[PDB]
Design a protein that fits this description.
- Chain F: Belongs to the WD repeat DCAF13/WDSOF1 family.
- Chain F: Required for ribosomal RNA processing.
- Chain F: It is found in: Nucleus, Nucleolus.
- Chain F: Interacts with snoRNA U3. Interacts with NOP1 and MPP10. Component of the ribosomal small subunit (SSU) processome composed of at least 40 protein subunits and snoRNA U3.
- This is part of a larger assembly, with chains A, B, C, D, E and F.
- By secondary structure, chain A is an all-alpha fold.
- Helices cover 46% and strands 0% of the residues of chain A.
- Chain A has 2 helices and no strands.
- Chain A has helices at residues 2-18, 27-45.
- Chain A is rod-shaped and about 115 Å long.
- Chain B is an all-alpha fold.
- By secondary structure, chain F is an all-alpha fold.
- Chain F has helices at residues 10-13, 36-48.
- Chain F starts with 9 loop residues before the first helix and ends with a helix.
- The chains are: A mainly alpha, B mainly alpha, C mainly beta, D mainly alpha, E mainly beta, F mainly alpha.
- The C-F interface holds C 1-7, 11, 13, 16, 21, 24-26, 29, 131, 172-175, 214-216, 316-318, 332, 334-335, 337-345, 349, 364-368, 371, 376-377, 379-380 and F 1-7, 13-14, 22, 24-27, 29, 31-39, 41-43, 46.
- Chain C binds one RNA strand through loops.
Chain lengths: 78, 422, 383, 111, 235, 49
RNA sequence: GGAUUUGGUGGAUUACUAGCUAAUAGCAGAGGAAACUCAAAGAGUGCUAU
């Protein structure tokens, strides 16, 4: 940001110093300030450390006994 | 599995058993107000005393909090331990905790919530058991000083593994990692339930929606290149918007509108989905601001359509709904403003829709055509249908005038349509 | 302590299932009902610490692990490429002995070996006398050997002269050792007497297992002859002779509350109020037309195709540890453990500092070996 | 005589009972905070014994009964089935029998 | 053509819309051998037999399913107890649901009907436009999940309680060889077996949810467990 | 049914205050305390030494 | 589109006669870095330890 800020500072200054009919508003500084803030935001956003993903392991599966209806109960004699 | 692996599972299950002094130090040391040493120095009742006052301030701000005084923040709750209860008792305890987190979601900026939640952490250990619920409430506060503390005292579930780096870290979670957690398909399913609960309960607030839509949009941008996963994002994310549109809150409706627009541009989709989309968009459209946002959206959803019927007339029921919620004078005002977005094919579908169903509205079509330059095919098709009207409908001063407008502009194409049709 | 009382006369305790018990009880005991699937080095012989805080496990193929089952921490794990048979904790959970092939070994709490007992050979059963700091061994050689851990010295060596030993159990009330023999006899032994104090014929075949209640008043024995007997050891009278066993007995255990546990393969049958002189307290399998006097099983369970290696009641706990071919499982047995423990003697919540303080004072008041007698009330008489 | 309400409140404190909280927890509802077509006659006449086969033995309401008619026999059989397969939510509470749910419907049809 | 067995009764369907009933000589015999009676369904009664199905707790009734509609026959008495209402689309697959009194019916044009037989009325309907059902199966692991197999070779899973599509498995079996000829959940497990005409049998399981709470919402996609197969054409 | 099991309140046996003395439970059932008279003699012998 | 490395699972690594069970039958060398990591100890110190 020091390098980036210095570059924009020169841009703002050369406008401030030499502009024949500069409006006392700082618009060039404001827009330059916006760019460096955008430069900072993306730069600080970067994370050198690796971010681990959720682990997805395939666990062993073994079936379990499940109680089920017997159709023999249906059949009956009158 | 090795003995340690099964043993490790036992350790997780009985994390809150409060077995010995050494474990109890860790459980009690966790805090949201005080540091570890002071936290171990405090007792339950002192914590309850502060929280009870904290709830009262919240009750003044918002009445619904007063209910929890009867069940969670009661004086007799001090003696209630979760480890001793049965499953039937636990779920009822969990459900009450679930509701409290939802209301506390919008007041995290207020100090009293942080004190009030301390009792839940200390008494019921929400941080270890209701770990997912607590985070889902506080995701949008990711940069807030409260959120980093949440990470320090808590064990991340499997789905929140992306945040493991920033636990007990000077820097807060950055903007990018929020996207990474959201890119995971399973988390969207988990959050899908969470936002679903808020919509049912009318607990949603602007910081959530705007945080959601703005995270949800970024998932599209990251995943734009690969079509197949975008296809997997359709059965889930579109379902989100339909629920948001169902919410009476205008806030949710526009939140859905931001979602629909980006999907269509990112991923072209059937006209059937688009026609269904506007119909749901229009079904619960009451607020003025949503009305402005919707009309912009509806144009965009057609802007993405690039198949036969791109400019075909809206269905009869579809046509009726649009005019009721958007008078013709409204769209004229829409067509007047100079910074209007491209809506040439939507209006073209509309002009034909008027042509088929309304005889009175023809003279507005003239004004509609003047306001917006229609592309020459859109002109050709409009010419095509109007030829049928003359043969079927009685000749009218407006009807011939609509022809005369086409006589003035691009005379040759008018003959071409006549040559092909009659 | 707990219980399993019925509302309705139809509703029977033995028909209840562990799933139903797990359903009613709270989460914590549901967690105490650990199950461990170890299919490789079985069968597994289990043993719990005196305070019930630690579990010592020994697979037949040589897998020995010591852990704090309740807190889910592994204290030691041993993978001896040898046949490991039975093991026991010494004065506390820190130090345990393993009856390996051809020798017995002492190990540290991390699992580090301390000594190999050259003198104890072919030992098949292990028991530790806490108040006397004596380790006992028995095996095929018919040699009953007592070793002092504190001094690391062999106290005494007594010749059974009855062949291999199939069962051994200590009497907590007088600390006299009971050994089963192929002639159906149960022999009582003391350090200072080169011949058994008492011999008790309790079977027509080899004595598979022997159990003694905490009070030292009753005894349960199971021979390899379709049989099980209950004895009054103080006065030496037979109380019950359960011959109706569907199968021969493998292991028996008696609880703090007095529950009688019988494992006959994967038979696991529990009886309440069976250790009483009354005839109606005689254990009976099933019921004869709902006869109230008949002592029906209190609880029963099915270990599926998994022969039970040994049974362990969890001290101060309503749980039955069961060692089997595929590993370990605790069954919820309401009203089995002692609800009110005594912390001066045994504390489940013992911290390291008062544990290590407990170590010295027990050493300071170690009872001499020769104090062992049939009657513990012998000290202090005119001679 | 029964205790007074002012006694019950105080006994709540002395003994530290928590049932009242749990009843409130059970009552906690989130929203507040925020005909047979045919008939078979053979069913009525058919009488079946229970005690012959082991599995049917469970169906007994009492030890004395041994033989039961078909109509009651089914009802125990249905109850025996429901224990085997608990009744899900979709079967009982839910039935199919501009509309805002258009998007949900179209997405279901289109894969 | 079709074979159904329940209790002591063996039911066989021939191509001529004739249903033969066999019964056991003895109650304690191991299989039925004796010929009880013959029941034939006429065209007026219904269309061609789709399958023979018997639902639980129905005291000697056979739930005969036809292309035209479903028919109920009491095998013991050999009488048509009930006739289901005519269905617009031909029925292709029938599967008894784990619930009492509902049977899942699959049509030619991607329609699954959970017809309640006791009430004799439709309860629900799932739409699969531009598809042909080949197999149905319910999950009995405690999750209200329905699998619908298609001749296209595509297996879809629905959550009945949530009325949503859990996941789709694409092209598991060749469409040229009939797609998914048969797909059945294992009784009481999260596992499903699948087969087809491509000389292949595949085996899929549903893993536990990765979310500590709301596991019903976060459903893991089914994962390939194992399979056996060979050449799809002569070597 | 009537299902009761032993129930340990962790707070009762492990106090919350790190400085507090742990509750020291006691029962006078003789069965919990074997070797009535030998222990006292050994302590007597220990005292005299 | 190409290349390098790697986690997990599946099938074999012994020749294919069904499951479950309580079964004569029932059932179905010297080192280094990281820590709200896990242990084993030593010393000192603090707090009514009455």
């Amino acid at each position: 940001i020091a390098r980036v800020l210095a570059a924009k500072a020169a841009v703002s200054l050369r406008y401030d110093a030499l502009a024949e009919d500069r409006d006392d508003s700082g618009d060039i500084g404001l827009e330059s300030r916006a760019k460096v803030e955008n430069r900072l935001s993306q730069l600080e956003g970067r994370d050198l450390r690796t971010t681990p993903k959720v682990v997805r392991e395939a666990k062993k599966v073994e079936m379990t006994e499940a109680r089920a209806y017997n159709a023999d109960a249906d059949t009956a004699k009158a | 599995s090795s003995l340690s692996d099964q043993l490790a599972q036992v350790a997780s299950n009985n994390a809150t058993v409060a077995l010995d002094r050494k474990r109890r130090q860790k459980l009690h040391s966790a805090s949201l107000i005080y540091n570890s040493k002071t936290a171990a120095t405090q007792d339950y009742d002192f914590i309850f005393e502060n929280a009870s006052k904290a709830l009262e301030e919240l009750s003044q701000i918002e009445p619904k909090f007063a209910i929890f005084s009867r069940t969670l923040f009661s004086e007799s709750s001090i003696s209630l331990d979760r480890n001793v209860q049965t499953k039937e008792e636990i779920k009822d305890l969990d459900n009450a905790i679930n509701a409290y987190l939802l209301l506390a979601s919008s007041k995290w900026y207020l100090a009293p919530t942080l004190h009030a939640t301390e009792w839940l952490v200390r008494r019921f250990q929400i941080h270890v058991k209701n770990t997912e619920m607590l985070l889902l409430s506080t995701l949008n506060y990711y940069q807030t000083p409260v959120f980093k503390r949440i990470l320090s005292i808590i064990k991340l579930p499997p789905l929140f593994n992306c945040l493991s780096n920033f636990v007990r870290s000077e820097k807060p979670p950055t903007a990018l990692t929020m996207i990474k957690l959201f890119n995971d398909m399973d988390f969207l399913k988990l959050y899908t339930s969470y936002l679903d609960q808020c919509i049912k309960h009318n607990a949603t607030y602007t910081n959530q929606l705007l945080f959601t839509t703005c995270c949800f949009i970024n998932v599209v941008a990251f995943n734009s290149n690969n079509d197949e996963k975008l296809n997997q994002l359709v059965p889930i994310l579109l379902e989100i918007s339909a629920k948001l549109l169902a919410s009476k809150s205008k806030d949710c409706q526009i939140a859905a509108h931001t979602i629909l627009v980006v999907f269509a541009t990112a991923l072209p989709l059937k006209k059937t989905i688009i026609l269904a989309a506007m119909e749901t968009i229009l079904s619960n459209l009451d607020a003025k601001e949503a009305k402005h946002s919707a009309l912009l959206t509806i144009c965009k959803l057609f802007q993405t359509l690039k198949g036969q019927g791109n400019v075909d007339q809206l269905p009869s029921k579809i046509f009726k709904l649009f005019d009721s919620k958007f008078d013709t004078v409204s769209i004229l005002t829409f067509l007047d403003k100079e910074d209007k977005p491209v809506c040439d094919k939507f209006i073209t579908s509309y002009t034909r829709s008027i042509a088929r169903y309304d005889r009175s509205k023809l003279n507005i079509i003239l004004s509609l055509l003047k306001k917006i330059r229609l592309e020459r095919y859109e002109v050709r098709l409009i010419i095509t249908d109007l030829i049928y009207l003359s043969e079927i409908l009685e000749d009218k001063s407006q009807l011939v005038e609509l022809f005369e407008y086409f006589i003035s502009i691009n005379e040759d194409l008018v003959l071409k349509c006549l040559k092909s049709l009659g | 302590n707990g219980y399993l009382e019925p509302e309705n006369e139809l509703e029977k305790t033995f028909k209840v299932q562990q799933s139903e018990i797990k359903s009613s009880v709270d989460v914590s005991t549901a967690n105490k009902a650990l199950d461990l699937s170890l299919k490789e080095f079985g069968p597994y012989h289990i043993k719990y610490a005196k305070n019930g805080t630690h579990l010592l496990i020994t697979g037949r193929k040589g897998h020995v692990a010591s852990m704090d089952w309740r807190k889910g921490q592994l204290r030691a794990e041993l993978f001896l490429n040898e046949t490991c048979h039975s093991a026991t904790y010494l004065q506390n959970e820190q130090y345990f002995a393993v009856a390996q092939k051809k020798y017995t070994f002492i190990y540290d709490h991390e699992g580090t070996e301390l000594h190999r007992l050259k003198q104890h050979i072919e030992a098949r059963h292990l028991d530790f006398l806490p108040y006397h700091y004596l380790l006992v061994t028995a095996g095929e050689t018919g040699w009953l050997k007592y070793h002092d851990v504190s001094t690391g010295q062999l106290v005494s060596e007594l010749r059974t002269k009855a062949g291999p030993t199939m069962a051994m159990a200590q009497n907590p009330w007088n600390a006299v050792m009971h050994l089963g023999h192929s002639n159906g006899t149960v022999s009582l032994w003391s350090p200072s007497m080169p011949e058994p104090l008492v011999k008790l014929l309790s079977a027509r075949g080899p004595v598979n297992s022997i159990a003694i209640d905490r009070s030292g008043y009753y005894m349960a024995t199971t021979g390899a002859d379709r049989s099980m007997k209950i004895w009054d050891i103080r006065n030496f009278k037979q109380l019950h002779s359960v011959e109706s066993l569907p199968t021969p007995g493998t292991n028996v255990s008696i609880s703090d509350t007095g529950l009688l546990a019988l494992s006959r393969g994967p038979h696991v049958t529990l009886w309440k109020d069976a250790l009483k002189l009354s005839g109606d307290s005689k254990p009976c399998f099933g019921s004869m037309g709902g006869n109230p006097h008949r002592n029906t099983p209190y609880m029963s369970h099915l270990f599926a195709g998994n022969k039970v290696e040994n049974l362990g009641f969890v001290p101060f706990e309503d749980l039955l540890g069961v060692g089997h071919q595929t590993g370990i499982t605790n069954l919820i047995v309401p009203g089995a453990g002692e609800a009110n423990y005594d912390a001066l003697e045994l504390n489940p919540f013992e911290t390291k500092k008062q544990r290590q303080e407990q170590e010295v004072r027990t050493l300071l008041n170690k009872l001499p070996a020769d104090t062992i007698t049939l009657d513990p009330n012998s000290i202090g008489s005119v001679d | 005589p029964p205790p007074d309400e002012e006694e019950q409140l105080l006994a709540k404190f002395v003994f530290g009972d928590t049932t009242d909280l749990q009843e409130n927890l059970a009552k906690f509802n989130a929203d507040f905070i925020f005909e047979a077509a045919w008939i078979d006659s053979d069913d009525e006449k058919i009488k079946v014994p229970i005690l012959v086969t082991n599995k049917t033995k469970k169906l007994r309401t009492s030890y004395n009964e041994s033989k039961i008619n078909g109509v009651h026999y089914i009802n125990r059989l249905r109850s025996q089935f429901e224990k085997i397969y608990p009744r899900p939510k979709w079967v009982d509470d839910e039935s199919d029998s501009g509309d805002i749910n258009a998007l949900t419907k179209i997405l279901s049809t289109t894969y | 053509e079709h074979l159904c067995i329940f209790g002591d009764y063996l039911c066989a369907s021939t191509d001529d819309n004739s249903i033969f009933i066999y019964k056991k000589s003895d109650p304690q015999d191991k299989y039925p051998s004796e010929f009880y009676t013959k029941l034939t369904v006429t065209e007026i009664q219904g269309g061609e037999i789709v399958s023979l199905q018997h639902l639980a707790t129905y005291l000697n009734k056979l739930t005969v399913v036809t292309k035209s509609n479903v028919l109920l026959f009491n095998v013991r008495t050999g009488k048509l107890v009930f006739t289901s209402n005519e269905f617009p689309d031909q029925i292709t697959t029938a599967e008894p649901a784990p619930v009492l009194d509902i049977i899942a019916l699959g049509t030619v044009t991607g329609e699954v009907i959970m017809f309640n037989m006791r009430k004799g009325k439709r309860i629900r309907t799932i739409k699969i436009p531009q598809s042909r059902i080949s197999s149905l199966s319910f999950r009995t692991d405690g999750s209200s999940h329905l699998s619908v197999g298609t001749s296209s070779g595509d297996l879809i899973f629905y959550d009945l309680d949530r009325r949503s599509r859990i996941h789709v498995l694409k092209n598991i079996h060749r469409e040229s060889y009939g797609g998914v000829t048969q797909a059945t959940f294992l009784n009481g497990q999260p596992i499903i077996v699948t087969s087809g005409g491509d000389n292949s049998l595949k085996e899929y399981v549903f893993d536990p949810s990765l979310s500590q709470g709301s596991g019903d919402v976060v459903v893991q996609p089914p994962r390939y467990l194992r399979s056996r197969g060979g050449h799809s054409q002569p070597p | 049914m009537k299902i009761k099991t032993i129930k340990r309140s962790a707070d009762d046996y492990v106090p919350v205050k790190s400085t507090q003395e742990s509750q020291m439970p006691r029962n006078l059932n003789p069965e919990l305390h074997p070797f009535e008279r030998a222990r006292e003699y050994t302590k007597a012998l220990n005292a005299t030494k």
